[PDB]
Design a protein around this ligand. Structure first.
Ligand SMILES: O=C(Nc1cc(S(=O)(=O)[N+](=O)[O-])cc([N+](=O)[O-])c1O)Nc1c(F)c(F)c(F)c(F)c1F
Ligand SMILES: O=C(Nc1cc(S(=O)(=O)[N+](=O)[O-])cc([N+](=O)[O-])c1O)Nc1c(F)c(F)c(F)c(F)c1F
Ligand SMILES: O=C(Nc1cc(S(=O)(=O)[N+](=O)[O-])cc([N+](=O)[O-])c1O)Nc1c(F)c(F)c(F)c(F)c1F
Ligand SMILES: [Zn+2]
Length: 257
């Protein structure tokens, strides 16, 4: 399959997924002097108090925490969105060194990692239908910088030993994703795509201005996960990020001055 190596990485993906060269691919560089302040953008509404996490799993390209999305329990509304989007999963992208790892960049600056909270539009009934629609998904992107530890991340860090290799999963209940959010919800937004295959152009991106800080010890434990399955030669799971794609005929909007 596809991956992040020399022989199967992002520069190869277009051969199996020709939309890789499409008109609204992600991630992009956010040029802060070209982003347009839009006063008609409304504040984000993040309602996660009733979130029910289920499992954590190594899927061979990242690790994901999955949630119960059978009811409106953890939802994202407002901002640039119409209607209600349910939280499905979150996952990360990170680097081998602290100056790389994020997918979006800000004035070409890379962060050490990027957190994606993936939500789908309830009017389409299930997430599979939503991926077929230009407004089907909303992904909330949060940058990680290395500094002080993030206490709300430690429960994720401490379970990573149990999902070291591809295909492993573990029970991961009662995790509160509100502990991963920055203080401010100011954001940029633009229409884009999934950043992994199938690279579907179905995503409203909401990228928060304020990074969260995590400690060197916390990010170091991300870098000990494996791309390989158990009993295979060890390949560290690092640099699972797609490089920035051409902005083409799109405008990035900012919620703030
Ligand atoms: O539809 C896809 N998957 C999918 C669909 C449904 S569905 O409900 O819409 N039938 C349900 C589930 N599911 O897991 O429940 C799914 O995983 N993949 C996909 C694709 F195959 C393409 F050729 C393509 F161009 C593209 F953008 C894609 F994203
Ligand atoms: O996007 C999916 N997962 C996913 C997205 C991103 S990202 O694009 O948000 N980055 C990163 C990672 N990751 O583990 O790294 C992911 O595993 N699943 C998915 C889906 F749920 C569907 F219903 C569907 F139709 C389809 F085609 C799908 F592919
Ligand atoms: O991944 C899904 N779709 C999908 C993934 C990839 S990928 O593996 O390459 N990323 C490639 C294509 N494709 O069109 O090629 C896809 O259609 N759906 C999906 C889902 F919605 C779930 F809720 C779930 F639990 C699950 F296990 C799933 F498998
Ligand atoms: Zn992602």
């Amino acid at each position: 399959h596809w991956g992040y190596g020399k022989h199967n990485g992002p520069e190869h993906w277009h051969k199996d997924f020709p939309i890789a060269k499409g008109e609204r691919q992600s991630p992009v560089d956010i040029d802060t002097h070209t982003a347009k302040y839009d006063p008609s953008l409304k504040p984000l509404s993040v309602s996660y108090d009733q979130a029910t996490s289920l499992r954590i799993l190594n899927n061979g390209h990242s690790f994901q925490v999955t949630f119960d999305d059978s009811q409106d329990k953890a939802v994202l509304k407002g901002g640039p969105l119409d209607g209600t989007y349910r939280l499905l999963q979150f996952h990360f992208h990170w680097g081998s060194l602290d100056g790389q790892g994020s997918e979006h960049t800000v004035d070409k600056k890379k962060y050490a990692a990027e957190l994606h909270l993936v939500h789908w539009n309830t009017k389409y009934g299930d997430v599979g239908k939503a991926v077929q629609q230009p407004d089907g998904l909303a992904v909330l992107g949060i940058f990680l910088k290395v500094g002080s530890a993030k206490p709300g991340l430690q429960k994720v860090v401490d379970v990573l030993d149990s999902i070291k290799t591809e295909g492993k999963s573990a029970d991961f209940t009662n995790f509160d994703p509100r502990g991963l959010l920055p203080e401010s919800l100011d954001y940029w937004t633009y229409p884009g795509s999934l950043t992994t295959p199938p690279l579907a152009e179905c995503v409203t991106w909401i990228v928060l201005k304020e990074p969260i800080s995590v400690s060197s010890e916390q990010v170091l434990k991300f870098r000990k996960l494996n791309f390989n399955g158990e009993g295979e030669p060890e390949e560290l799971m690092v640099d699972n990020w797609r490089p920035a794609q051409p902005l083409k005929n799109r405008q990035i909007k900012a919620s703030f001055k």
